[PDB]
Amino acid sequence: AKDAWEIPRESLRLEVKLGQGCFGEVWMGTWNGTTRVAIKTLKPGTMSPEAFLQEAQVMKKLRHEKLVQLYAVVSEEPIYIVTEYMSKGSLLDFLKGEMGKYLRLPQLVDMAAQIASGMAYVERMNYVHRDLRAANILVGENLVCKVADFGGAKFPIKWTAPEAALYGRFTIKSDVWSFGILLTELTTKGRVPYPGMVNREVLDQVERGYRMPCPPECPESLHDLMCQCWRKDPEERPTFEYLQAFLEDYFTSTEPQYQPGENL
Numbered sequence: 272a273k274d275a276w277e278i279p280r281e282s283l284r285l286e287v288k289l290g291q292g293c294f295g296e297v298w299m300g301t302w303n304g305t306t307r308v309a310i311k312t313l314k315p316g317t318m319s320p321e322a323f324l325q326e327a328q329v330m331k332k333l334r335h336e337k338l339v340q341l342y343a344v345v346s347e348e349p350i351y352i353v354t355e356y357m358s359k360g361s362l363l364d365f366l367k368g369e370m371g372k373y374l375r376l377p378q379l380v381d382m383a384a385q386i387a388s389g390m391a392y393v394e395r396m397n398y399v400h401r402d403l404r405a406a407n408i409l410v411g412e413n414l415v416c417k418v419a420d421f422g423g424a425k426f427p428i429k430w431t432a433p434e435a436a437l438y439g440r441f442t443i444k445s446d447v448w449s450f451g452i453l454l455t456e457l458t459t460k461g462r463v464p465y466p467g468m469v470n471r472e473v474l475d476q477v478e479r480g481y482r483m484p485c486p487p488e489c490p491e492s493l494h495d496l497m498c499q500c501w502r503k504d505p506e507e508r509p510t511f512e513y514l515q516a517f518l519e520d521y522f523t524s525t526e527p528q529y530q531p532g533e534n535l
């Protein structure tokens with residue numbers, strides 16, 4: 272006796288290795304021979320089985336067309352987590368790669384709108400992401416983007432709100448700060464934010480009120496949105512609901528005069 276999420280081990284086929292960790296592996300493959308899936312492995316005796324199925328428990332109560340969807344679990348060791356497959360890989364890779372170069376503002380704002388949509392769901396459900404950035408966004412056909420999480424210790428300090436990096440105060444509002452940084456990533460073809468700066472200068476500078484400038488060819492109105500996401504006070508930051516609707520309507524309500532340029 273166990274979950275309706277459980278599947279028989281023969282229904283899974285692991286076709287292509289998408290990468291490795293110290294806790295296991297991730298593969299693209301097939302489920303019931305018909306459906307393309309992403310499959311995550313737990314190397315047994317390298318981390319708690321309970322600690323691995325934590326994610327799966329969380330992903331069970333999560334269901335949105337812009338969050339990576341859990342498909343199934345093999346909940347006894349060797350454990351397996353199975354999700355939908357996103358054919359185009361990370362937004363980060365997609366932005367810097369050969370696709371990057373044809374993306375203009377209308378595709379990029381649309382992508383931001385989807386991510387804001389997935390995040391407004393996270394907001395509605397009172398969850399926190401904690402590592403929102405282009406490396407945790409997945410791209411599918413048709414420029415579908417979805418919010419993922421691939422997993423102190425380390426720090427993506429550059430994407431992380433000050434009250435979070437410094438005192439561990441992670442909220443939906445610290446995700447909003449990150450979303451602002453993700454907007455720069457989307458407008459610079461995936462360049463690392465705060466160019467030339469290192470972690471300590473970023474922390475020193477942002478604390479004194481430095482904010483990245485408007486990217487080249489990015490409308491000021493979009494840079495203003497970023498700046499609202501970067502307000503010193505976490506509660507001055509807007510909601511993802513606001514963000515989602517601002518970006519959906521962008522080319523009618525905010526930049527109706529927009530003309531394509533060289534990069535954006």
Ligand SMILES: COc1ccc(Nc2ncnc(-c3cccnc3Nc3cc(NC(=O)c4ccc(CN5CCN(C)CC5)cc4)ccc3C)n2)cc1
Binds near residue numbers: 297356409
């Ligand atoms: C060329 O290169 C590639 C690479 C990838 C792909 N296509 C692909 N499509 C699908 N998934 C993967 C994928 C790749 C690598 C690792 N994981 C992947 N997906 C995946 C994702 C998850 N989990 C999540 O995304 C996730 C998302 C949100 C949450 C919410 N929490 C966040 C944490 N908070 C503190 C609480 C709330 C929790 C978990 C679990 C299991 C798997 C297998 N790749 C194609 C080509």
